[PDB]
């Protein structure tokens, strides 16, 4: 059992692609545009 932090809080909305944060999610939503692209994927649980 290792005690580390990978995805237990930090950058929930903050852009991870480039690593840019914004005061409000509003402006952030538009920022995602720069990272425009396709990503097909069906429903999968498990
Ligand atoms: Zn970005």
Swiss-Prot record:
Its annotated compartments are: Nucleus
The C2H2-type zinc finger ranges are: 13-35
User: Which superkingdom, per the lineage?
Assistant: Eukaryota
The task this protein performs is described as: May be involved in transcriptional regulation.
Protein family membership:
Belongs to the krueppel C2H2-type zinc-finger protein family.
Would you tell me the protein name for this molecule? Zinc finger protein 347
Organism from which the protein derives: Homo sapiens (Human)
Q: What is the lineage of its organism?
A: Eukaryota, Metazoa, Chordata, Craniata, Vertebrata
């Amino acid at each position: 059992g290792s005690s580390g932090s990978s995805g237990t809080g930090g950058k929930p909305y903050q852009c991870n692609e480039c690593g840019k944060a914004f005061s409000q999610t509003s402006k952030l939503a538009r920022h995602q545009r720069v990272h425009t692209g396709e990503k097909p994927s069906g429903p999968s649980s498990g």
